[PDB]
Every structure is written in C-alpha cells, then in structure tokens.
Design a protein around this ligand. Structure first.
Ligand SMILES: [Cl-]
Ligand SMILES: [Cl-]
Ligand SMILES: [Cl-]
Ligand SMILES: [Cl-]
Lengths: 205, 202, 205, 202
C-alpha cells in the first residue's frame, strides 16, 4: 500500500517534550484517501538527523514526505517554501555541534523549493478556521538542515516523490516560560497537520 | 452564593464574540459554595453600564468578573486598573465614538481591581496557561465597563470584589487579520474556570 | 518664567540614560518667554521623589515635564495617566524591589496628566515624528515619579501642569537587545523640544 | 574602479523611497580607491532587471550592492539569499502582480550573496548601528532584483560580488503606519556607507 511518511524531532535539550512529535503521534497508522501514514522521530542533531531521515525514507519508500518542526514565536501554522544549503547555529544542537556558515551538503545546489502544494494547504487551513501562512525561511538550524536534506535526497533518488516542511508554534505550556509568546493548543496543532497532510495528498500542484 | 461573570455581544463586524462563547459553558456550575451566573451585555457606551448595573442588582453577587476580547494579545490578561476615560478609535455598535470624555463625571481618575490578580495569573501559569497582569484595559468599551463596575461596587456595595479578564482572538478570527496570536475556545473556557475559582478561593 | 524638565541617571546596566542625553541640549533654552531648566534624578524608589520635590521647590516652575526611557517602544509616547502602585520586576539603582505597594499611601488610585497630550502627539506626527498617547507608564520608577509629581503639584501648586514623556531605545542600546526599535538622540531631542513648546503654548489662556 | 549601488523609486503610494534618499549622499564618494555610482531603478517586475542589467553594462562595476525598503523591520538587514520566485501580495508600479512565477525561467532555485555579510553586520553593530543577517528578501520586486543581479553577475562576470541590504521605514513613514519601527535618514546613510566600506575591504 501507499505510504505517507511524517517526521518530527526529539526534545531539544531544554524542553521535556517536542510538540511536533506530540502533534503527529495521533496520526500513527491512520488512513487518508488510501495511503497510510507512518511517523518517525529524528534526533535534533546536525548530520545525524539526515542519517535517521534517509533510513526512514529508505525503509518506507513513501509517496509523500512531510517533516515537521517547531518555530517558537510564530503565531500560526507555517508551510515552508524553500530550504537553503546552510547550517548557521545560534546555539548548539543536542550533541554540542554549533556549525557556522557551512553547507548542508557540499557542492549541492543553493536551495530546493518544496514540492508540496503549499498555497492549497494554507488555503485549506484558513478555510477550516486555522491561521496559517507560507514562510520563505525555515531558518538555518536543524529544521532547515533536515528540509534541505530531504529535498536533495528525493531529488537524487526518487524525483517523483514530493517533500516539504511544516512549522508549528509553541504549545501553551512553553509560552508560559517565554512570557509574551504566541502559542497553539496540542489539539489544534494535530488537527492542522491532519488537514495539511490530506490536502497535500489529494492534490499535487 | 453568586458569582456574576459578564461578556459582550459581538463588535458589529464579527459574527460572534469569543468572550461570550467562552463563558457560556460556565453557567450553573458550582464553585466551592457558589454558583456561577452569566449575562451578556451590549457592546456600546453607557448602555453597557445600565445592563451591567441591572445584572449586579438582580443577582447580588459576592464576586463580579467581567470578560472581554483583546485582539492581538498573546495570552490571558487580568486587568490591574480601570480608567475614567472614554476615547474611541472606532464607533461602538450604536455609532457613538466618544473622545476624551469621562466614564463618570466627577468620578475618581481610576479604580484598582479588587481581585487577587497575581494569584490568578499564577494559577494559570502553573496550569500551563500563558497569562499576565495588564496595566491598561484600553479606552474603548471594555475599560468603560470595568471602570463602571468598580465604581458601582464602590458606591453601592464595597465588600464585593470586581475585576476584568481579557481573552485574545479565537483562531478563526486570526485567519482574518493574518499574523495575529490566538487561543482556542476550549483553552479560554478552561483558563476562565481556573481564573474565577482562584478569585473566589482568595 | 520656568519650565522644569527632568530625566533619570543611567539605570545600573546602561552606561548612559538617553532621556538625560536627549534633554541636555535644552538646558537654558527659551520657549515663548520661558526658560527650560533640566534636572537629573536618581533611578531609585522614594529618593527620586525627594530630588523631584526639591527641584520643584527650587525652580518654582509653571510647567513640569518628566522624561523616561521605555525600551521596546517604537516611538515617542506621551503618558495619559499615573497609577498609585510600585511593582518592580527587577531592582532599582539602590537594590529596592517593591512588590504591589502604594507610591503614596492613601493617595488617589491615579492622576491624569494635566498636559495637552493629543496636541503634543499631533504636533509630533505633523513634524514627521512617530508618536502616540500611552495608557500606561509601567509600574517602575518612571510611573512612581509621574505619580509623585502630579500628587505634589496637586497639593502645593494646583495650577501647575505636569506630565511624563517616554523615549525609545537609542540605536547603540538596540544593538545588544537584538531585534529592538530605536530612535536617534538627534530625533529624540527634536521631539522633546516640539513636545515642550506645544505643551507651553496650550497652557496659557 | 566602480561600486554600483542601486535603489528603487517611490512605490506607488509612497512619496519617496528611503532606499534612494539614503544613497544619494554617496554619489561619487570614494571608498578605498573605488568610487561609488548610484542608480535608481523602477519598482516594476522585469523592467527593473533591464535597467539593472544596463547599469552593470555601462558602469562595469567591481562590486554591486542593491538597497531596498523593508517597512516594519527594526534594523539594517543584510540579505543572505535570493529566491527564484515572484509572488506579489499587491501590484508593482505598473499594475503587474505575478503569482508564483520564476524570476528567471530555468534558473537555479537560489543564489547566495557573495558579500561578506557577517563582517558587514559586525562593523554595523560595533559602530552602534542595529543590524542583522536576513534569510529572506521577500518575494516582491526587491528579491526579484537581487536574484536577477546575482544571476546576471554569475553568467557574465563571475568575479564580481553582489548583494542586497534592506533599510527600515523613515520616521516620516512610520507616522502613517503608526506603531512602526523607524530609523532616521542620517543613520541610514551612515549605516550604508559603513556596510559598503566593509564589503569592499573584504
Ligand atoms: Cl523541533
Ligand atoms: Cl469583547
Ligand atoms: Cl529612564
Ligand atoms: Cl524599496
């Protein structure tokens, strides 16, 4: 059967949970228009993250791959337009790496556009009453690193397969710490991802 | 014993007002020894106060908490102070757009809320709900109603504590604006429950 | 005929206070037959009111305007109301961190500024300077002082109008604080001058 | 030996364009034995590229920095990457509003700026000017021009480095837009002069 692969990260150091993981956990094993969703959690570590990712794309041979990360501070669900060939880290990752301006993949192209039907996804979300928008930057931390890796790997190995990235905001419990920071409940998050993934599946363009 | 909790009908534009939606589920529920009553008031200057005064008079509450919506805010906010000024960016549902007039002529400049605001904000934070104390309720209808409330309690029944909570946008309303913070109806309702129970308990 | 303008000495961290830097050029300057007198006051609860009360007695001014810094704000803000509360998130220059205490016991809950605030915001906006009326002066030393000021004038010299103005970060200040709005000293001085002239003009007959 | 520096004409609504106003004083100013040439280009898709390509052909520059307005940003921003997409919220000066079309058909997805972006941000910060690297130059005419610039340079004169700097609103402009960050004209001109000196030296 057809498989949609959805990924997320383990907690980043400080946090005790990763919301992105928590949000997709309810999707495990569910069916959408004749494809079953597989999930898989990857470490929040440069390069080691791509290894885990590649293994997952390899094992599951998915028709659609969607990675999810957390973008603390953003007000809404954001669907990434583009991944950039650059690691540049404000803080270190889970294994203590803090690369400065080094390529995700050496001699790889400057960027890859997501192949997902991004405007339709954002449109679907807005219509469902969920705030959502297209983003032009996935950042330069692990989230963008994984998005670039994904899109490159699909382009080298299985070019018909569509890949992309979705960032969720802070959970309310996390915004309590930060203080004046936007959040979204776990429940709404899980619903937003579900709507986005169905919409990604139905369409293409 | 009675806890009166109020909200507004929608600001002309919107089809609903989140604040009314959020406290509907609270009606009838028992809090320690007290029962919650709700009552919706029109979102327009001076008439709002009349409906309010009516409700306080009918229910004779031990504790009155008014709720309104503060589009743009990221979290539940509990108000510190109400100010004796109407100054309106837009008109209310009835076309009034007062500029720099008193809420109540010869009334004091301001009233402090009587609620245990910090404790409430703590209960909410502990529960994993973003919340903070605010020093401005605005100068539109919400502040109008807040100042009016506290002045009426101060005149007619000084032992009764009053105050104000602002809720952010619902998610559906933040689609419209675009890049604006929101909070689901469910979470509001839970936050208000915790907030009210805390005020009563203290 | 004297206009007293006050500002603070730098708050512990900072090496200067912009509100002070901004009003220095105004010392001795004429405005419609009045003289500007400036005075720096300590950023400490209670001691500040002492300096302030001293300066008012000394200079016997017909108009008093106090200036402070509101890191974060984008523009010039003219305060509408002073609140009778001290609530300190961090301590003052002398280690005091009062939590929910009167500025003045048994004083009224608040004081409205007696200054012509809309006309001041308008004179600023018309001269191309971003400005707006503010409904809160915070609950640190700046509001503490605004409140004491209005109280003191009300009690001793009731025809004398008082009010508070907040300036934003200087650009050098915003460098550290990363993503923060600033305004140059030059613009700040210019704004304060226009604000003060406008105040003096609409405090006549 | 010429540094070409470009800016846009006022955008439809606006009466001036801060990007142009801030580079005017730089005309013919010398920096380390190079001379600065400025040129204003239209805020129209494609037509802008034709002007740009012509200025590069005429002036034969060793360095090319394009400047633009990013209303709302708090500081000077130095762009890191240009994106091969036109996606316009509103139309350009000539009524064009492309939705999701390539800037240049069959071009690579992006170009990195060849400027020393971190060094420029550091010199600015060191000099007390707020500034930072940006990962998106938007998808309107500014990004359009950046991409065209870097692509043109790469196909015709690959030795020559190119890049983009965004400036915030002038205070004049933030008066309208209300609660908006600004930076005075003088501080912009200063910032731009330090960035270009730094870019040339490295
Ligand atoms: Cl994450
Ligand atoms: Cl409301
Ligand atoms: Cl200050
Ligand atoms: Cl521009």
């Amino acid at each position: 059967m057809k498989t949609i692969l959805v990924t997320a990260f383990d907690p980043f150091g400080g946090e005790a949970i990763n919301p992105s993981w928590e949000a997709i956990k309810p999707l495990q094993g569910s069916q959408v228009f004749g494809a079953n969703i597989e999930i898989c959690q990857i470490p929040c570590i440069f390069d080691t993250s791509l290894e885990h990712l590649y293994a997952a794309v390899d094992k599951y041979q998915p028709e659609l791959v969607i990675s999810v990360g957390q973008a603390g501070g953003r007000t809404n669900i954001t669907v990434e337009r583009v991944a950039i060939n650059i690691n540049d880290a404000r803080i270190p990752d889970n294994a203590g790496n803090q690369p400065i301006d080094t390529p995700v993949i050496v001699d790889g192209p400057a960027a890859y556009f997501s192949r997902l039907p991004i405007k339709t996804m954002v449109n679907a979300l807005n219509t469902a009453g969920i705030p959502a928008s297209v983003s032009q930057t996935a950042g330069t931390f692990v989230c963008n690193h994984v998005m670039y890796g994904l899109l490159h790997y699909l382009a080298q190995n299985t070019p018909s397969v569509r890949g992309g990235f979705i960032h969720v905001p802070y959970l309310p419990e996390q915004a309590v710490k930060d203080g004046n920071q936007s959040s979204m409940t776990l429940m709404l998050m899980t619903l937003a991802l579900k709507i986005a993934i169905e919409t990604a599946w139905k369409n293409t363009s």
